[PDB]
Each structure stands twice: as C-alpha cells, then as structure tokens.
Design a protein around this ligand. Structure first.
Ligand SMILES: Cc1cc2nc3c(=O)[nH]c(=O)nc-3n(C[C@H](O)[C@H](O)[C@H](O)COP(=O)(O)O)c2cc1C
Ligand SMILES: Cc1cc2nc3c(=O)[nH]c(=O)nc-3n(C[C@H](O)[C@H](O)[C@H](O)COP(=O)(O)O)c2cc1C
Lengths: 174, 174
C-alpha cells in the first residue's frame, strides 16, 4: 500500500512551508495520502475507527507538522491519545504499528544553529522530537530518521526545494 | 501572590493520582489556585485574556498533568500555543514569565526503573519533559525541578503520601 501522511497544522492557509509540502504530495495521490486532521476534524471529534482503518490500509506512516513550542500541534497530540489505543496500537493484541515505518516531517521557526549545545536552544532537534520517537518505539514501530526544515524570492525558492526534498525523502521511506 | 496550578487532565473523575493531588491543594486556596483547564474550557475555547491575567495575578506557575505518550494532554499543548503569545510571554514586550518560577507536577504510568538508559524507555524523565523545559526557558522563566510520581490499600496509602509530598514541593517552590 501507499504512505499515509497525518498532516497536523492548525492554520495551513496562512502556512507557507506545510502548504507547499502538502501541494507537492497531492501531486502523487497514488503513492501518498495527505490526511489533514484540522480539515477533517474541525471540531476535534476524531473518528477512531476511521483513523485506525486508514492506517491499516496504508504502509508507512508519517506525522507532518510545524514545531510549536518544541512540540506538536494539539490536535496531533489528541490524535495520538485517541487513536493509539490499547489492544490496537499496543498491548497483547495491539500490533497495528509493529514493524511499521514511522517518521516525522517537521518545520522549525528557528535556525538549525540554535538546536545545538552551543546554540540558543541548547538541545538538538532529535532531543526535541524524543516524545514521538518514544511513542513510535513503544508501539514497536520501525522509527526512521525525520525530515526537517528550518524557516523572499530566494527564500521562496528554498521552500520549493524543500518540497522537492520532502518527496525524495518520502520515496526513500517507501 | 500565590501559586497558580494549571491542571490539565482530560478525565480527572476517573483519575486517582491527580484527583488526590487536586483535592489536597484545594485545602489551601489562600496559597494555591487550582485551575482545571478541561473543567473551565470543556469546549476548548480558551479565553486568552483571562488566562494571561490569571498568571499575572499569581506568582509561581505550575503545570500539573498526567504523562500521555511521553507528552502532555492536548488541551495543555493548546493552552501553551494560545496563551504564550508574542508580546506577552516572549518577544520585545513579552516579559510576563521573565524570572517567574515555572515547574511541572506530573504522573507516569510506568516504573521509574523504565526511564533510564538500562530501562525499557531508554530515556530519563528529564529528557521526556524537555519540550516544556525549553518552552519555559525560551520565555526567560526560572524553570525549577519537576515533581514526579510513578504509578490497593498499600497503593492507596502511597498516593496519599504523594499528595502530601506534592504540598511540600509546592511550599518549597514558593
Ligand atoms: C504558538 C507558536 C509556537 C511556536 N513555537 C516554535 C518552537 O518551539 N520552535 C520552532 O521551531 N518554531 C516555533 N514556531 C514557528 C513555527 O514552527 C514556524 O512558523 C512554522 O514552521 C511555519 O509554518 P509553515 O511551515 O506551515 O509555514 C511557533 C509558532 C507559533 C505560531
Ligand atoms: C492515551 C494514554 C497514553 C498514556 N501514555 C503514557 C506514557 O507515555 N508514559 C506514562 O508514564 N504513562 C502513560 N499513560 C498512563 C498515565 O500516565 C497514568 O495512568 C496516569 O498518571 C494516571 O492518571 P491519574 O494520575 O490522574 O490517576 C497513558 C494513559 C493513557 C490513558
């Protein structure tokens, strides 16, 4: 099957990076499925059954989102809590993610130079994303290296380049 | 002023640890203010102005919540994104948290032995909570060591003891 992209962005219209990323991926619907949580669940009423079946019908799983306060948007956190249930994602009968490739595709609003021991943040991007790595590993998934991008003509071209790199990263994952 | 406790638990009624913690703190309303996000905002419509003013009228700030998927409950993440705005919590005019004591009070559903290099999780609790530490530090707050507890008669007594320790930790923070 194809790769399922769980895209969580509270306002993708005002988005530049994720909007470009989303557009690029929707050009190959036979290879990827862009699932926009905020668009599908504008009231936050996640359909667990629907979400789980979507994952089962796909192969690799990707969580795409902007890094807000060194974390994910709220709807993604809710998605994790309500979709990865005991008996499905983990626990005795829960093997839905066992051996499944899981990776993150994220954007950061600070320079990469900041996420270093000698940088303003003092921590690496990997240390920041640890919660999601632990989540995937807990469910016995095959956690893969994340796709990252740190955020106007030249700038616009760079974002376009990132979108192309994202596609390549996606294919590699497959 | 007193300490403001931002308590984020999606179902505190079915809670045992946080329910006991909350009850213990509400015994001293002249020292602490328990602000239950899910009870105050059952529809997720956070009143930013109200939240910010609440923090300004208090001294130390505490975020109390159960660790769900090595992270916080969704409403707390939303709270962080919507309340810590540019010009208030950070940025040129944003000094609302500057020098303010910020700490977390959390419960974990796995033994402490798991959160070690030689444990099932492979990471420490500190590495897990990093996102919140970075958030507080980014806003120039005085991040303090967190209060942690790893989760029936003897068990019930231990939870009661944890509630007492929480109070002591709270006073120390003050
Ligand atoms: C509430 C709020 C919190 C933010 N926190 C962070 C932060 O912790 N680290 C970071 O990399 N960027 C931070 N940002 C910036 C966004 O990551 C950046 O603007 C985003 O990648 C751009 O979105 P887009 O890619 O959809 O255009 C924050 C922005 C907002 C809006
Ligand atoms: C959706 C879901 C995800 C959970 N994830 C974790 C986990 O990452 N680490 C952990 O310490 N406990 C985990 N737990 C267990 C809770 O932390 C534990 O049951 C909680 O502290 C108990 O709540 P109470 O203290 O209000 O009684 C999870 C529970 C649920 C319900």
């Amino acid at each position: 099957p194809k790769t399922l992209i769980i895209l969580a962005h509270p306002n993708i219209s005002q988005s530049t990076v994720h909007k470009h990323w989303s557009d690029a991926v929707r050009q190959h619907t036979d290879r990827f499925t862009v699932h926009e949580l905020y668009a599908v669940y504008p009231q936050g009423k996640i359909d667990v059954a629907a979400e789980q079946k979507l994952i089962e019908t796909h192969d690799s799983l990707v969580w795409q989102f902007p890094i807000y306060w060194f974390n994910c948007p709220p709807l993604l956190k809710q998605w994790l809590d309500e979709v990865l249930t005991y008996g499905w994602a983990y626990g005795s009968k829960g093997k839905a993610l066992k051996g499944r490739k899981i990776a993150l595709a994220v954007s950061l609003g600070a320079p990469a130079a900041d996420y270093r021991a000698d940088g303003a943040v003092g921590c690496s991007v990997a240390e920041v994303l640890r919660p999601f790595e632990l989540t995937a590993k807990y469910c016995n998934a095959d956690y893969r290296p994340p796709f990252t991008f740190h955020t106007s003509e030249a700038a616009r071209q760079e974002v376009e380049r990132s979108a192309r790199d994202y596609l390549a990263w996606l294919d590699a994952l497959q």
